[model samples]
Target: YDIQAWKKQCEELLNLIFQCEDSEPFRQPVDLLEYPDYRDIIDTPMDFATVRETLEAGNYESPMELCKDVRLIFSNSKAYTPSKRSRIYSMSLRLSAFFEEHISSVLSDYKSALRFHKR
Candidate 1:
């Protein structure tokens, strides 16, 4: 069950990542690492390999592209739970898509700060 506030928070986070440059240097290493883990894997004749890939690989290099890709892939998918194999509704993603499509420009300033500042 998603709450209105969850959407607000997701939008807040996405906005921050968008305006990353003007924001502060990423403060904590862990904070940055905690962002996301996206990868594209391929089977090789030699052995199994796990290569980390980003939207950057497919030519989505710009900040807007990167953030949009992240938002698109994750937000559009139904939330899931590992243990129960049950679907969980993430207010975060739902809110993220909403805010990006709706209140993006008005909330632009602080969005950069939230994502770029703490890192």
Candidate 2:
């Protein structure tokens, strides 16, 4: 119902993301030496650790903002991975779906609250 609730949900969801088996690659920044072109391609690189830091530091305004960064993790991986059969590529998709499903319920309540306030 307020920022506190949103922040708590973000923390919980991020924790769940961390627990994912295929989430290893997204835990930190991609190794620049391994993927030299990563920075060149991903203008705004995002990961689970970075998002967790931002959430802890109170940088995000709302759940949507947090979700934006969370979604970027997948988009960046999808962009760099290219190979549909690769493990990381597939994991990103799986993780992305999981977040959306969970976050959708979280936001749906927020939306209803907003609708209730409408005159």
Candidate 3:
């Protein structure tokens, strides 16, 4: 999958929290756990680790199955819900594109080979 979008969203959210000042200090070496919403965003690394583990373990029979887990990790949280007033506004688009870019190729063996080999 194009992990860039997911990485971008996490970066953007963390940046937003870092911008806070005064009563909410940006704090050196900020801990993502300090923010409730950030807890969800911060789990991305763990999600990827699980995805890799699933693939290596042959637990994912197909890319779509793996994609399901990928989507769950991002979409399961309220923080990712589209909200103009929120940092994750329109984040769904990024995730959707990421999913499509990865899952769409799985249906065809040729496409899947090209897709995975490209990276």
Please report the candidate that would top TM-score against the real structure. 2
Of candidates 3 and 1, the better by TM-score = 3
Question: Between prediction 1 and prediction 2, which has the larger lDDT?
Answer: 2
Model 2 regions more than 4 Å off: 114-119
User: To one decimal, what is the Cα RMSD in angstroms of model 2 from the true structure?
Assistant: 1.7
For residues 3-106, could you state the per-residue lDDT of candidate 2 as single tens digits?
24777877888888889987889999888998888887899888899999998998987777888898899999988886988889998888888889999967
lDDT of 1 by residue, 1-119 (tens): 22123334434554564444311221112122432431212111110010003331344323353345444433323322232332322433444455457545433634555556557
For model 3, residues 1-119, the per-residue Cα lDDT tens digits are 44223333333333443343320321232245655566545454324445555666667555556667656555543344446455433443454455456455343553445477686
Candidate 2 lands at a TM-score of 0.89
TM-score for each predicted model, relative to the true structure: 0.25, 0.89, 0.42
How far is 14's C-alpha from truth in model 1 (Å)? 5.2
Candidate 1 global lDDT? 0.34
lDDT of 3 at 84: 47
